[PDB]
Amino acid sequence: MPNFSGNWKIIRSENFEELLKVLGVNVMLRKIAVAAASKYAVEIKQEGDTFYIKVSTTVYTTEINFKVGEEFEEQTVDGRPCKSLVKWESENKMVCEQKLLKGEGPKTSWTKELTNDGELILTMTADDVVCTQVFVRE
Ligand SMILES: *C/C(=C/c1ccc(C#C)cc1)C(=O)OC
């Protein structure tokens, strides 16, 4: 039955540069990151409240495994290691709060939502700034 599980390809990306800006990424690298973001692909396998998620671009790929409700370790959009904890906000929306392992920096979080007409929306927040990325099934 249809859930988050699937192969997703990006079709829109709003506010990504502004998010990197907040994270201290210089202009040249942000522009390269924006260009790379248009090949974001996401693969999700979901069973119950257990998730496997592989995000990749042209040159880079990462995998995370988590269970809703259980702390896990990942990294921030700008690659700082963090501790993460995902909770449901509705049937097909989940929200993750992150805390830096070492250091200080902006407050980061992310969401994933399956909409009623079959999109996956990702949002990523750093302080006041919200990047939204929309995906459709491959
Ligand atoms: C789930 C997830 C997807 C994602 C897309 C793009 C980037 C970048 C850079 C990172 C992740 C996530 O939690 O990212 C914050």
From Swiss-Prot:
UniProt entry keywords in alphabetical sequence: Cytoplasm, Endoplasmic reticulum, Isopeptide bond, Nucleus, Retinol-binding, Transport, Ubl conjugation, Vitamin A
Name the encoding gene, please. CRABP2
Where does this protein come from, organism-wise? Homo sapiens
Q: Name one GO molecular function term.
A: retinal binding
Main location class: cytoplasm
Gene Ontology biological-process annotations: embryonic forelimb morphogenesis; epidermis development; fatty acid transport; positive regulation of collateral sprouting; regulation of DNA-templated transcription; retinoic acid metabolic process; signal transduction
Localization recorded for this chain is: Cytoplasm; Endoplasmic reticulum; Nucleus
Q: Where is this motif: Nuclear localization signal?
A: 21-31
Cross-link named Glycyl lysine isopeptide (Lys-Gly) (interchain with G-Cter in SUMO), sites: K102
Entry-linked InterPro entries = Calycin, Fatty_acid-bd, ILBP, Lipocln_cytosolic_FA-bd_dom
Kindly give the Pfam families that the UniProt entry links to this protein: Lipocalin
Matching SUPFAM superfamilies: Lipocalins (SSF50814)
- GO cellular component terms, semicolon-separated: cytoplasm; cytosol; endoplasmic reticulum; extracellular exosome; nucleoplasm; nucleus
Reported induction: By retinoic acid.
Subunit arrangement? Interacts with RXR and RARA. Interacts with importin alpha.
Family the entry assigns = Belongs to the calycin superfamily. Fatty-acid binding protein (FABP) family.
Protein name listed in UniProt: Cellular retinoic acid-binding protein 2
Binding-site positions, all-trans-retinoate:
Q133, V134, F135
Gene3D superfamilies, alphabetically?
2.40.128.20
The answer, when asked if Ubl conjugation is one of the entry's keywords, is yes
Record text about domains? Forms a beta-barrel structure that accommodates hydrophobic ligands in its interior.
PTM annotation, UniProt: Sumoylated in response to retinoic acid binding, sumoylation is critical for dissociation from ER and subsequent nuclear translocation.
What is its biological role? Answer: Transports retinoic acid to the nucleus. Regulates the access of retinoic acid to the nuclear retinoic acid receptors.
